[PDB]
Design a protein around this ligand. Sequence first.
Ligand code: AGS
Ligand code: A1JJ8
Ligand code: ZN
Length: 401
Amino acid sequence: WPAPNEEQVTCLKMYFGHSSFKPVQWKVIHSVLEERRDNVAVMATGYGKSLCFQYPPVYVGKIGLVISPLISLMEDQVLQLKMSNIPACFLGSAQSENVLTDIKLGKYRIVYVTPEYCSGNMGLLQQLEADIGITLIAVDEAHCISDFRDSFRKLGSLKTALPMVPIVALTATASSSIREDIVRCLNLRNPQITCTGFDRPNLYLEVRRKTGNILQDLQPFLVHWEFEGPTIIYCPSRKMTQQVTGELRKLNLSCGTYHAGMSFSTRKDIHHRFVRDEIQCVIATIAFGMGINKADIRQVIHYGAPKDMESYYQEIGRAGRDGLQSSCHVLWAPADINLNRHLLTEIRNEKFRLYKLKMMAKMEKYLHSSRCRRQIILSHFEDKQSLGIMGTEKCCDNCRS
Ligand SMILES: Nc1ncnc2c1ncn2[C@@H]1O[C@H](COP(=O)(O)OP(=O)(O)OP(O)(O)=S)[C@@H](O)[C@H]1O
Ligand SMILES: *CCC(=O)Nc1nn(Cc2ccc(F)cc2)c2c(C)cccc12
Ligand SMILES: [Zn+2]
């Protein structure tokens, strides 16, 4: 593996603020720049997935095409890139002809599009490749889920229209059948397969039981009444989020409810007030998670047994992005496990339904285990990826008993 040169490190430092690449970020970045190779990367939350697709076009001063149906989330990335002096924009049918002209003139490093826009605009992408050059196409499977196979099927012609352009496909699951469905839908040619599973040593892990009274359960975390710091309380349902918000509001707590059933403006308001610390706690479903852009989330409380080990690992990685000590508590009851099995029936892919079932069995072992919670989670990664935090009072509840 060739090491990054000084021109590469200077670019990384001035446009991204990082003094070095992480091993898999460089494996992906270098593979795109030098080999023009397709990539499938299993991304652990908090690792650094955005650098993998944003850095290569910024370095060579060309275009990176980013494909996702989540337009408002993509427009937040545009504003963040703007603050780093990286010209970026979202391109669609509502988006002006002056922006399209500037895209064709090579004025933007990163262009965000939806899979549907991409489907009827292969001629434009061939012109952009011919006139400026497309360093890479990026698509995250975790963004196309509401079934990524129908969004990714609209992207099957990308490889025939642009055979020289590498596709970097990201995934939030280590499922081998999902990786092979991504390789088929996108028609990837010998992609580099990477996994970024890592320990988050600044997150303390705990599993605890629900007493049968919301205020009784959430009282220990309260120190007027207030939480220790910015908190997210995850609930299995929209109704559960309103019930918890109601109980917390009896103690005049700075609260905001968040679920996918809420309107765009209402959700955007709760999200922004959380970032500005106008609310201290978000009682949410897992709809609140992607691009929170809040570094100081101190506490994640899963109010209900997590659906499975993989998704729980991904959800807690949203806490403590600043590197300071954070806590992740599970408050569960046996009845939740019966209700969690009902969500496996709504998984259409049979090969993934069997993978999620294994992940659910691992979550059940975790909830009933007396062994180090961190050791159970790390038992899915390379023996390199921790004896430091492990065994100490900051590791997990089981290490303290
Ligand atoms: N090379 C790096 N060195 C240090 N920190 C890094 C590096 N790459 C990324 N990070 C940090 O890793 C964290 C996660 O980055 P990303 O995965 O790009 O975040 P994201 O795309 O906003 O993901 P979500 O939506 O919040 S899971 C951010 O705080 C980055 O600044
Ligand atoms: C290739 C090694 C690797 O990083 N593997 C990997 N497995 N998983 C699934 C997982 C991890 C931890 C856990 F507690 C349950 C399930 C990964 C995820 C979820 C992301 C990135 C890499 C992962
Ligand atoms: Zn431990």
